[PDB]
Amino acid sequence: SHMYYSYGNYEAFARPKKPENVENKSAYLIGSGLASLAAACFLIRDGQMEGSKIHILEELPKYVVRGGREMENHFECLWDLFRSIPSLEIDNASVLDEFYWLNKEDPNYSRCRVIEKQGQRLVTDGDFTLTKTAIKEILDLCLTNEEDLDDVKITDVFSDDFFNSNFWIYWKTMFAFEPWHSAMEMRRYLMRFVHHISGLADFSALKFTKYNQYESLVLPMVEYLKSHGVQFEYDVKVEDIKIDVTTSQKIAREILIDRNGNAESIKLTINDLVFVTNGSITESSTYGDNDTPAPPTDELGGSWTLWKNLARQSPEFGNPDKFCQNIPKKSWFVSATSTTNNKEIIDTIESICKRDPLAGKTVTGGIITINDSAWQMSFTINRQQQFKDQPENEISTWIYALYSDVNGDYIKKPITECSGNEICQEWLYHLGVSTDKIEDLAKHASNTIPVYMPYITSYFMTRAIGDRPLVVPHQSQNLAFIGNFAETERDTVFTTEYSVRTAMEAVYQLLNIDRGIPEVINSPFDLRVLMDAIYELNDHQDLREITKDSKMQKLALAGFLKKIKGTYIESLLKEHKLL
Amino acid sequence: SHMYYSYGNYEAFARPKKPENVENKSAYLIGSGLASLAAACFLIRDGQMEGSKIHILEELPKYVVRGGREMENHFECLWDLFRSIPSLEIDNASVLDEFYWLNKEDPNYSRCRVIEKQGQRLVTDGDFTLTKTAIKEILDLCLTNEEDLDDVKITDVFSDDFFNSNFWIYWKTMFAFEPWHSAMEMRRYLMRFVHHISGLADFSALKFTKYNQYESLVLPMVEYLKSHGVQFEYDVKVEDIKIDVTTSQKIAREILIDRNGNAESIKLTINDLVFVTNGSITESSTYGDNDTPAPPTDELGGSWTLWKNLARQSPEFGNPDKFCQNIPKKSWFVSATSTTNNKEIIDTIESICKRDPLAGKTVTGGIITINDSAWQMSFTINRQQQFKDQPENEISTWIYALYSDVNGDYIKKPITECSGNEICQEWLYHLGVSTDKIEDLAKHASNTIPVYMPYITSYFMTRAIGDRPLVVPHQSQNLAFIGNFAETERDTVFTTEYSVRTAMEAVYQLLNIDRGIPEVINSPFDLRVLMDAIYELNDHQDLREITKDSKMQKLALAGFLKKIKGTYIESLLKEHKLL
Amino acid sequence: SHMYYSYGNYEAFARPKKPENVENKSAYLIGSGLASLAAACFLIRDGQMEGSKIHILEELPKYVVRGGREMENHFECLWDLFRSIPSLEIDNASVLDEFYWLNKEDPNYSRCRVIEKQGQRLVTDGDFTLTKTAIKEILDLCLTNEEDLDDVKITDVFSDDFFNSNFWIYWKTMFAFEPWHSAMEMRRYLMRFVHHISGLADFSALKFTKYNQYESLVLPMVEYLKSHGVQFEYDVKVEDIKIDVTTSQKIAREILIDRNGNAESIKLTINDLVFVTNGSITESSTYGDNDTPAPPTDELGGSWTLWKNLARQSPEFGNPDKFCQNIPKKSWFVSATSTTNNKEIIDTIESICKRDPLAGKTVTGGIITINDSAWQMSFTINRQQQFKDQPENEISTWIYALYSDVNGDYIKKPITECSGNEICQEWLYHLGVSTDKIEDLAKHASNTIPVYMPYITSYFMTRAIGDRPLVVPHQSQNLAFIGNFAETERDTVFTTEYSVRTAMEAVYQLLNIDRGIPEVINSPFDLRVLMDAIYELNDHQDLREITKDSKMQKLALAGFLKKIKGTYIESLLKEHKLL
């Protein structure tokens, strides 16, 4: 009870007092990821901790696109943070100001979503094509308690009708689900993005940065932190943190680090806070080129080794083996990015996405799903250029495939065995380019850089409660867990919001900052949102059309409309066009 | 349209673009009320209009408490405004920053709410004592459409069971309802403060400023506006504004003013905005003293004359005669404020409110309702001192009475005929002070200043749709109506929020500022809020105890719990202690 | 939480670590009572706080017995404290060592308990004479929840049969109950002393000090504290403690004291602990002599004024007016002590108590109840001499009367109007002394000093939960409430155990000392104890004799003995002579 959830404008603009004894506190932060830098910015801003007392420990010494960085308006903790962060492109404005102004003048929306048979758009695009049984299973999943879904796969809760629907095609590609993933984590997405079901197929509710998130989010935060004098230590490899787990309290006592190849230790008091980003989804990422495949691997890196060393000291520090071990070989492993300036590939893209890729505006609106591909290939093109020095005549696309062990259509090899051009070979095949000019474009007019992330589907692995540590574990004094693998309430992993939210909850609990953490948006608990979900899920159908065939449901519906005739409920029903 | 409602932290911290053609636009603002000054601050901040283009027109040239200034956290538009306003008491903080910090180190709560029999606390205090029929009428009021409630009184929808409840005692005094008031405006309060029902009896949900709202709100806004060079014109008596109504658009052409007794005119273009505060509840306020009663009056002031002049120019500018005429004589007219340093008056209050009035903290927590009084007297004491130069040994209390034509208990005269001491005579009588030393305490040990507001109940008068003009009327170009008498969506009059909201909606619609106006909070459409309301309305009773007597409700409930056994709904029911 | 209850020898002999940050902490203790000095000893011993950081604030500058100080073996927190306290009589031993050795060589037991008709022992002595309905009401009281007994009087739960029993005669005189006292506090005594029901009439389970508790308990603790350098401030009158009760935490900020007549202030940090003994039962005690009555009064003293000042700052600091106000005039107010060396009074005492009063051993074993007296007079004689300078030929007895407003039998005056001799006049009347030589013995051969405690029955006043503050209130940082008026779990007020227990709980919670506080003994939860209670309450009767008349209870009993025949339960039944 060191924190409380709040919402509205009262706690949003309120600044908290400087919490007690902060001037004698220090903070050690492992990693320089999004969650780590977010916690460093909260300590400077809300904790009012001076910059010399904050230490950032980074592994590394002092064109690839990491796609999937969808954002929406209700990332409450992200915009709380990216308010005081000054931007690096325009003056006298924040990172939110650029993000707000850019997404209001160029709204993001996709005029094409799913293509099949080598170029043709899907005929049932836009519709969800969910059967009544399929919608029933969606409601049953949402109505099951989270504690009852321990180690439950997606296939354990859904049937054949749901997976054959266009809803699952949109769902499995936006968020990169697999059928063997966590039902808890899918249930969280259903509750979190229930207010965006209308803007699900066409990506109207998605918001994107001007560039990649490294330069749009991380670099502004790095510059903000360095302006406050935050100490950055480089070439520091953290082996483990000595935790003494007593019957009454847990303190991080000492951190064993490898500073520039020299193994030595930093001592800790109860005042010296430690923020741990347990796990990493980009760890041990091998790279390739247009000529050679990215070599597969499963070597555990520093972030996973740190969690495995911490998990031994206490059972409520989590089970990293539920995520980093026994990842199915069919799962998403290989992502590719392709940079080209060839005109007829762009024209082939323009024939599908109905927009000019070199225009400097929204190009694809999001991702394009190849339905007929055995790889389940999906590709996206963001607002070109995504990079500062990228020439204005070049576009950069991002290609990933969900299934990995299956042979492709144009190339009878798995994605893990395909080189950079061979990924671009099949990508041009499913765009409708003929089988004659396809080979020389990928090999000579295109440059494709594959990357093999072995842990890119870790956060969606089937888990039980307690497999992920709490953001601040029970009875903990200076140890906090942040990042996508730290357990918090009702929020959803693999979002930039979740890493920032866990950063905010950790700083607020450890420092006892008296300000409400903005809760996850109350979309599932809103009558208006739930009424829009019912209308959208059964393909824009009124209550009379939903129950037009079943006699029992129509009878209860007929009685219900008698009891609400000429009432405020009926006006709600009409104005959400459910009548 | 010209505006859109929004919620969340995305549109809260986002600064909008400078709208087009602003540097060629000017604004003329009638009055210096809260709504007028808020509109001037929004034009400076969100419209980025230079201060020389904004004119404030004030009637007046250049201890009394105007109570009823309840504030709660979900005044979304108010905290949006009082964010950039710097405070005048502490440095490097806003008005909200003081407001947040002062209501966290001294929370508001009432240790006594209703007293009767000359001092003793009401035995059923805290309980609502609502029957099932009474709660049914509460929900039926909420479930009727606002269009079907035109010119509908409170007594037209409620029965004797509701009026005999402790809920109605709390409700009629917090907001100063009368039984002959608008059912629309009561229905809006029920939906607006449905999330504060748990903190309704003890005032735990209310928030207060350090001083009176003139010095805590208006003076910080005045100093903010003066630092930006906003021009204040005094001695300006506005007769009418020339409005030409075409079939396509309406433009404020010319304003007729009486500048320091000199009748003259100011020209207007379409770029020159006009903000009219139609009507005023403090208009034609006669004052009394400790010896003479406040002289009753029914004289229309400048604001009501200005609205009556405008209403003849167009049918959709509203009907001011529905509010400023035919106010019943039993309605609230007289308010009194009593300043004393006498010990046994203070000690009598200390025995009732259970707190030290001179401590500088919460004293009464809000109002104290005298249940047995014929006047329906209710008095409040805020954080003393409420004024700057007031000596530290004095308290200043605020007394008002709802009924006005009935003789009091200690004094057999109506409140309209009682002098300052005579109001203090009966107030001390209902505090339990002995009726022998009561005379010289009011006459010599206390100073009471009555004030007669003839229009303090105008906003609650029974009305139809269109009786209040829209904030920006349909097809209007530079004319906007602000204040408590402008019609907006789902929000509640006689709050500081409503005047600020109508100020924001006017500035944003006229200037086409492309930023989401924060909507009224979605408490009535929230499942969690509604479930807490059901628990609190019938006095902390589970579903089984609510339906323990009716067989029809019991039978349907038993079949309902079988259908939600072991689901997320049942977890929602139990965590809100309804199950 | 911050403390945990434990029992057994593991946590008894275990010493805890020095808790963190103690060397920067200080403690201010109001009063020099038993609870205050006990908390000072726990800070020195268990908290390992150095003596210079502990301040004792005593109001006072630098032949009366305050009897009723019964002790028993299961005062777990008292013997935990009086282990390290060295004694002042014998060398190389503790206070417990003297108490243990003295109460095992001279066991306490009473050969006479109740006398009536001026000298004759009661014929039904030893027996309880409880009816089956009367025992049923005892079980019903014990089986009601404590939360369901708010403001419940003794007469509200018991009937005529219970008060006519000899059990109520023993109960009302040992603990000084009145019929208008708290049913919660009686229920606690029934559960606490359920294992001493056998030793109830004859006082076999009671233990007594060699002298009064001032030199048996307080002076050894004072000498122990002064040996550690504890700072004693004298002539310090505490008016109030400035508490700021925020929404998240409560800190004692500043204490307003009157040091030697000079009103000044001592500042506090969060580290400076404050221990408040709210209320006092010996406060405003007026004294008398042999010739004039002790003057009645009800003037609130310093300890009650401090609680009343603290109760205003927060509602969970208690309601002192439930205890110090509206004490019924029939309640116990006057206690008298009589010192004499006249031989025939001693012989009359010896004829009743069957033991030599000058022997230096147990004299009365406890108290003697006058059943026929309208005053309900009870008198006791402890191990003479109770005082060091008291001559060896003198005995000192202690007389108190429960009813106060009723005229006595020998003297038709209330006890409040009787002088010292007049109390001794009626005391000799009920001892059987002739009505002729009675007058000159009290007036000339005896010296009786009355004392009027107006608040001696405060702790038994009817209360609700929350009327007494928690030992450490919720969300409190350096403020703790100790003494008989602080609320703790399952323990019983007006015992030396309770004041020491609340001292231990306060020190352990505030300092976070990691050692189990010994729980209140588990006698009500023990099968063996409950079986002995059933045997003793119905006057040493087997199960067959208990239900030998009721056919319904015999039927269930007959089937019960068939199910447990030849089992361990039957052996338990036989060895506790219930079967």
Side-chain angles (χ1 to χ4, degrees), chain A residues 4 9-11 15 73 92 97 100-101 104 143 145 187 514 519 525 527-528 567-568 571, chain B residues 4 10-11 15 73 76 92 97 100-101 104 143 145 187 514 519 525-528 567-568 571:
Chain A
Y4 65 102
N9 279 4
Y10 190 53
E11 303 271 358
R15 293 190 294 113
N73 52 303
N92 284 335
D97 291 355
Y100 186 71
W101 294 336
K104 70 190 286 184
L143 290 176
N145 299 294
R187 187 227 172 187
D514 199 77
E519 69 176 4
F525 309 113
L527 277 297
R528 321 182 306 232
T567 59
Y568 188 53
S571 295
Chain B
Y4 65 101
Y10 190 52
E11 302 271 358
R15 292 189 293 114
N73 52 303
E76 306 288 292
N92 281 335
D97 290 355
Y100 189 70
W101 294 337
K104 73 189 283 186
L143 290 176
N145 300 294
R187 186 226 173 187
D514 202 76
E519 69 175 3
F525 313 116
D526 197 58
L527 276 298
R528 321 182 306 231
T567 60
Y568 186 53
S571 294

Side-chain angles (χ1 to χ4, degrees), chain C residues 192-406:
Chain C
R192 171 69 140 87
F193 307 99
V194 69
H195 63 283
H196 283 341
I197 299 173
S198 54
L200 190 72
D202 61 341
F203 289 161
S204 67
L206 273 73
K207 306 292 178 67
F208 288 137
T209 53
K210 187 57 209 69
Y211 310 90
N212 52 3
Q213 78 177 357
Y214 180 57
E215 193 275 331
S216 292
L217 301 191
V218 175
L219 282 176
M221 274 190 314
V222 162
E223 185 69 28
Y224 170 80
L225 288 175
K226 286 184 179 179
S227 73
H228 276 113
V230 170
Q231 296 298 109
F232 277 77
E233 285 87 3
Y234 300 87
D235 293 288
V236 173
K237 194 260 184 181
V238 180
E239 282 85 2
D240 51 353
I241 302 153
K242 177 66 179 67
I243 307 295
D244 48 351
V245 183
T246 75
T247 59
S248 64
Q249 67 174 344
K250 303 168 216 169
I251 305 102
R253 293 290 186 185
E254 180 258 323
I255 307 170
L256 287 87
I257 61 172
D258 183 74
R259 187 180 297 276
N260 202 359
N262 296 11
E264 58 97 16
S265 295
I266 174 66
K267 303 306 205 212
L268 296 172
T269 71
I270 188 150
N271 306 299
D272 299 333
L273 306 185
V274 173
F275 292 77
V276 189
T277 312
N278 48 305
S280 172
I281 78 178
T282 66
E283 200 68 33
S284 305
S285 297
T286 59
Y287 279 60
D289 52 351
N290 209 63
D291 284 25
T292 62
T297 177
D298 52 355
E299 199 271 335
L300 295 171
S303 296
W304 289 107
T305 315
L306 179 54
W307 196 7
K308 283 178 74 66
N309 292 356
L310 287 185
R312 304 177 298 170
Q313 311 201 55
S314 189
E316 65 266 13
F317 288 166
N319 306 105
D321 301 2
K322 291 290 297 300
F323 307 109
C324 72
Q325 306 278 352
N326 311 303
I327 305 176
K329 288 313 180 184
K330 206 187 217 187
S331 67
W332 173 30
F333 282 128
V334 191
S335 173
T337 183
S338 183
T339 305
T340 186
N341 52 3
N342 181 249
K343 290 177 175 298
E344 69 189 3
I345 293 149
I346 293 170
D347 285 0
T348 319
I349 283 159
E350 189 175 1
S351 76
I352 301 300
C353 80
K354 308 303 174 180
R355 276 179 292 233
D356 178 37
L358 292 172
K361 296 290 181 68
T362 291
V363 172
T364 51
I367 70 181
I368 311 296
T369 297
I370 314 296
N371 214 356
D372 287 333
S373 64
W375 287 356
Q376 299 272 30
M377 182 183 287
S378 309
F379 67 99
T380 181
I381 307 190
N382 288 318
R383 301 178 175 117
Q384 303 311 303
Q385 280 75 53
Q386 288 269 293
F387 304 95
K388 277 73 69 178
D389 305 358
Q390 197 179 2
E392 303 178 63
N393 58 298
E394 307 190 340
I395 62 169
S396 179
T397 174
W398 182 64
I399 295 96
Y400 74 102
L402 299 163
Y403 303 141
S404 291
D405 53 359
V406 295

Side-chain angles (χ1 to χ4, degrees), chain A residues 19 27 41 68 110 146 254 265 277 286 294 320 330 334 469 513 536 539 567 578:
Chain A
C41 291
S110 179
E146 192 157 299
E254 180 258 324
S265 294
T277 312
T286 59
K330 206 187 217 187
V334 190
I513 300 180
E536 287 292 329
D539 285 359
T567 59
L578 277 170

Side-chain angles (χ1 to χ4, degrees), chain A residues 342-543:
Chain A
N342 181 249
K343 290 177 176 297
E344 68 189 2
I345 292 149
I346 293 170
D347 285 359
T348 301
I349 283 158
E350 190 175 1
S351 76
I352 300 300
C353 80
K354 308 303 174 180
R355 276 179 292 233
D356 178 37
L358 293 173
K361 296 290 181 68
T362 291
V363 173
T364 51
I367 70 181
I368 310 296
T369 298
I370 314 296
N371 213 356
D372 287 334
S373 64
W375 287 356
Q376 299 272 31
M377 182 183 288
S378 309
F379 67 99
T380 181
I381 307 190
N382 288 318
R383 301 178 174 117
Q384 302 311 303
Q385 280 75 53
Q386 287 270 293
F387 304 94
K388 278 76 57 188
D389 304 359
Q390 197 180 2
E392 302 178 62
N393 58 298
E394 307 190 340
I395 61 169
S396 179
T397 175
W398 183 64
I399 296 97
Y400 75 102
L402 299 163
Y403 302 141
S404 292
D405 53 359
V406 295
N407 291 4
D409 292 330
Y410 195 54
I411 298 98
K412 273 84 175 174
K413 300 166 53 187
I415 184 61
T416 62
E417 310 178 359
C418 288
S419 65
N421 52 0
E422 303 174 62
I423 305 150
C424 202
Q425 287 289 144
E426 191 165 356
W427 177 52
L428 275 297
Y429 170 63
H430 287 303
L431 282 173
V433 180
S434 66
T435 62
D436 314 300
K437 66 180 76 173
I438 182 171
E439 194 169 358
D440 51 355
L441 287 174
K443 298 173 91 76
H444 312 116
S446 167
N447 187 20
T448 316
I449 303 299
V451 58
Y452 186 93
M453 282 86 74
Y455 308 118
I456 207 68
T457 45
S458 308
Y459 41 82
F460 283 160
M461 292 300 291
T462 67
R463 72 192 193 249
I465 52 171
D467 285 1
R468 297 182 325 192
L470 288 182
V471 179
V472 166
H474 187 233
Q475 293 205 340
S476 174
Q477 307 305 303
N478 53 355
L479 177 76
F481 284 112
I482 52 178
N484 283 331
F485 288 113
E487 160 74 23
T488 186
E489 209 269 338
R490 272 179 55 235
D491 208 12
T492 55
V493 305
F494 200 46
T495 58
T496 46
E497 157 80 3
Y498 198 94
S499 65
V500 175
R501 177 181 288 279
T502 47
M504 188 200 285
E505 299 202 341
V507 171
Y508 274 48
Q509 284 181 253
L510 287 188
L511 276 193
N512 291 114
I513 300 180
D514 199 77
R515 181 180 179 270
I517 297 89
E519 69 176 4
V520 184
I521 198 67
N522 42 62
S523 297
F525 309 113
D526 197 59
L527 277 297
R528 321 182 306 232
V529 172
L530 289 188
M531 290 172 68
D532 285 290
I534 287 174
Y535 182 69
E536 287 292 329
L537 280 171
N538 44 65
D539 285 359
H540 295 241
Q541 277 174 55
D542 293 31
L543 270 296

